[PDB]
Design a binder for this molecule. Structure first.
Ligand SMILES: Nc1nc2c(ncn2[C@@H]2O[C@H](COP(=O)(O)OP(=O)(O)O)[C@@H](O)[C@H]2O)c(=O)[nH]1
Ligand SMILES: Nc1ncnc2c1ncn2[C@@H]1O[C@H](COP(=O)(O)OP(=O)(O)O)[C@@H](O)[C@H]1O
Lengths: 396, 350
């Protein structure tokens, strides 16, 4: 019933690991809110958001030539291997230098393609020094088809430094298809996967390394295998403040990933809503200035992009299902919102009534967010749903 | 015997996959296979032949093609009235002296007869032996000389290519198979050494796992008494150490088979040859034609399966470039590393 309590209470409704800010930051904002200094309250929220936005993620990817390093990097960036900006194979092996590849929509998420150690004349420890091991948030060893000595030497060296790495086994779809083709009378999809996995586990143990996190996946089909659990593990290993950026950058491959992005962005809306000042008028009796409408249109465009239902993303889907974009757009809701018989003003008014009927005003009696923020929540629900709708089609 | 039976059971386990890759290997040389098949079996599945030795007349029923070599096709055949299956090797004639070369091969083979020995040599009836066989097809002349032998379950070359396709040697069983093959290769080479014998072709395409799981070496015509001098060209260039690349004529030595043994053990764990040597049918292979061409003369294990140090050491010692300092197989079996190999195999088996 008091505003600072309502503010902090919103975050408690999210599970540990889904919080966008630390308890320390929450405590500071709550403290300033209680002391009634709005200016310091704003600056605390602003500082928190800036720390979140300016966080940089550096992801290293090492492994043999042709192990699927560039493919893995492209898949996480949501970029096709032949599209512009795609990481290309072979090149790092010639230069013998790491190359950075930025996420297209969240450029503070940076993937580094590292040359295979075998492409250098570096022993493992020297190789890690030269590749700047300690500068990465995640160090990922990519391996395909069969474990190589180089893969395990790098792992043993990292274990020797008492640091961490992830092991990603790519091209499992290939091993599955190949055993299916070669041994149909005895082929079992689940057994092949299990045996590849145990071979990975066993290889580490046999070589004196505590088993690292291990993920079997396919760069060709994100609809299956360990991509979702990989994401879970990576984000969990991050400090809270880096989570937002990494999370919003992730490929929209499961309902859980999509839902988790929604949860983070809902907290961002809450922070932004409080930073903007709460008001004492109900949002069904206010109107949108052009400056608000502009902010809304930019919000919708950011959301659609984050969730892969933006124009470009829809076009790509259209070519691949071999159809017109207007057929893809017609499957979902977000593309029509700011499109020409009910006016935009009537439409946004209707969204307010629908949202506030279903969810209330989120705040103690007689306090409200500015109308634009209920609209952002509404847009976020819509874009989230749109992404699940299209994912159902893709992953099938 | 313990290892033999394990290999036998593993072969049975991978039988369908080996069969698949065997058929896959025949697609590229399809025109050759079909033309040779049509020459030897111009009617239906049976062809009547006479033994060049004491074995009299036989009818050989074609079961299926098995393998293609540089100038040969090997078929699985059946002698129905004897109730016996055989591998049958048939030779194409490119050379003008293909005929005299085969006559020479015949004499050398049967004079000489762990070693895969021929069972018989036969000629299609009503046509002279060794001469080009009718009906002739223009792209592939076939000699009227057919070599009958026991059929291997798989040759190591095909095994390696199969593993490169899908690496079915996973877990402790696959790893154990690698250990057993390593030990079998060493004992095979050691056995030759003990008899003062040298083979010019101790190579994966001439190393055969038999249905009982035993590893055998083929082509008894290429066996030499140690110290014998012969054509250096008889050694496959990618399996020849430097001292076999510098002369028309070379002395056949235990050092040669130590080198070749090192190559084959390396391939067991790595699939490709070391030193960037071209290894047809394996993806990770570079293109170095032979050791006379400059390249990486250092022994690199980075792209191999993670092999144990005791294997690394043994390979390193067999692959000493100095022809006076290579570890010989008998000596290798007395090493602690070979002891360790044997104990890993013994512990894993029982
Ligand atoms: N089927 C399948 N192919 C893959 C996968 N990852 C990579 N590839 C293919 O393997 C080849 C090499 O991958 P690439 O990313 O270019 O290798 P790298 O950058 O050198 O490590 C390319 O043709 C890819 O399309 C996968 O998960 N599944
Ligand atoms: N008895 C056998 N059983 C199964 N495969 C064999 C047998 N003899 C030879 N082969 C295979 O047939 C192919 C050609 O054999 P060969 O004529 O000895 O070699 P090349 O023709 O390449 O000199 C090789 O892959 C070899 O492994």
């Amino acid at each position: 019933n008091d505003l600072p309590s309502s503010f902090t209470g919103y975050f408690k409704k999210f599970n540990t690991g889904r919080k966008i800010i630390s308890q320390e930051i929450l405590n500071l904002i709550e403290l300033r809110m209680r002391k009634g200094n709005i200016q310091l309250t704003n600056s605390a929220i602003s500082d928190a958001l800036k720390e979140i936005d300016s966080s940089v993620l550096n992801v290293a990817v090492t492994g043999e030539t042709g192990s699927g390093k560039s493919s893995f990097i492209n898949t996480l960036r949501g970029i096709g291997n032949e599209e512009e900006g795609a990481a290309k194979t072979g090149v790092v092996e010639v230069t013998m230098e790491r190359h950075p590849y930025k996420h297209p929509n969240i450029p503070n998420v940076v993937f580094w393609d590292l040359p295979g150690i075998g492409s250098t004349n570096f022993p493992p420890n020297t190789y890690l020094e030269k590749m700047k091991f300690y500068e990465y948030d995640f160090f990922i060893i990519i391996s395909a088809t069969r474990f190589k000595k180089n893969d395990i030497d790098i792992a043993k060296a990292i274990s020797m430094m008492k640091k961490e790495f992830y092991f990603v086994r790519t091209k499992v779809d290939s091993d599955i298809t190949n055993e299916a083709d070669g041994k149909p009378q005895t082929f079992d999809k689940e057994k092949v996967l299990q045996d590849i996995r145990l071979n990975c586990v066993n290889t580490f143990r046999e070589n004196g390394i505590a088993e690292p996190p291990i993920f079997l996946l396919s760069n060709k089909n994100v609809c299956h295998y360990d991509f979702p659990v990989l994401m879970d593990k990576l984000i969990s290993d991050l400090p809270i403040y880096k989570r937002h950026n990494f999370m919003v950058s992730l490929p929209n491959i499961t309902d859980s990933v999509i839902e988790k992005k929604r949860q983070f962005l809902k907290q961002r809306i809450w922070l932004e809503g409080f930073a903007a000042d709460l008001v004492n008028i109900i949002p069904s009796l206010t109107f949108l200035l052009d400056s608000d409408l502009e902010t809304l249109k930019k919000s919708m465009k950011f959301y659609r992009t984050v969730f892969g239902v933006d124009e470009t993303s829809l076009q790509r889907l259209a070519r691949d299902w071999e159809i017109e974009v207007d057929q893809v757009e017609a499957m979902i809701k977000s593309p029509a919102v700011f499109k020409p018989e009910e006016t935009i003003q009537e439409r946004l008014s209707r969204y307010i009534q629908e949202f506030c009927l279903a969810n209330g005003y989120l705040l103690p009696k007689n306090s409200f967010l500015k109308e634009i923020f209920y609209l952002k929540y509404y847009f976020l629900d819509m874009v989230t749903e749109d992404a699940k709708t299209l994912l159902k089609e893709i992953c099938l | 015997e313990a290892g033999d039976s394990f290999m036998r059971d593993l072969l049975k386990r991978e039988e369908e996959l080996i069969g698949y890759c065997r058929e896959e290997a025949l697609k590229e040389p399809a025109a050759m296979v079909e033309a040779v098949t049509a020459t030897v079996w111009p009617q239906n599945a049976e062809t009547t032949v006479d033994s060049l030795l004491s074995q009299g007349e036989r009818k050989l029923k074609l079961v299926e093609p098995l393998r293609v070599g540089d100038r040969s096709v090997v078929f699985l055949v059946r002698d129905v009235e004897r109730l016996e299956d055989f591998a049958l090797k048939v030779f194409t004639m490119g050379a003008e002296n293909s005929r005299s070369e085969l006559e020479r091969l015949h004499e050398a083979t049967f004079a000489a007869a762990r070693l895969l020995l021929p069972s018989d040599a036969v000629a299609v009836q009503s046509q002279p032996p060794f001469a080009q066989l009718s009906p002739g097809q223009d792209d592939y002349a076939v000699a009227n000389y057919l070599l009958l032998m026991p059929a291997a379950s798989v040759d190591l070359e095909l095994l390696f290519s199969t593993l490169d396709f899908v690496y079915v040697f996973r877990g402790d069983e696959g790893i154990l198979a690698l250990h057993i093959l390593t030990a079998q290769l060493i004992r095979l080479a050691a056995n030759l050494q003990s008899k003062g014998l040298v083979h010019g072709h101790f190579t994966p395409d001439n190393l055969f796992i038999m249905p009982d799981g035993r590893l055998m070496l083929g082509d008894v015509s290429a066996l030499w008494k140690v110290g014998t001098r012969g054509p250096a060209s008889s050694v496959p260039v990618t399996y020849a150490p430097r001292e076999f690349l510098n002369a028309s004529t070379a002395t056949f030595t235990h050092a040669l088979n130590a080198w070749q043994l090192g190559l084959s053990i390396y391939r067991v764990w790595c699939l490709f040859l070391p030193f960037g040597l071209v290894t047809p049918g394996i993806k990770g292979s570079w293109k170095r034609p032979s050791l006379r061409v400059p390249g990486t003369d250092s022994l690199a294990f980075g792209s191999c399966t993670p092999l144990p140090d005791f294997v690394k050491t043994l390979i390193g010692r067999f692959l000493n470039f100095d022809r006076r300092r290579r570890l010989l197989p008998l000596e290798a079996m007395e090493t602690p590393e070979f002891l360790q190999l044997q104990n890993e195999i013994s512990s894993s088996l029982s």
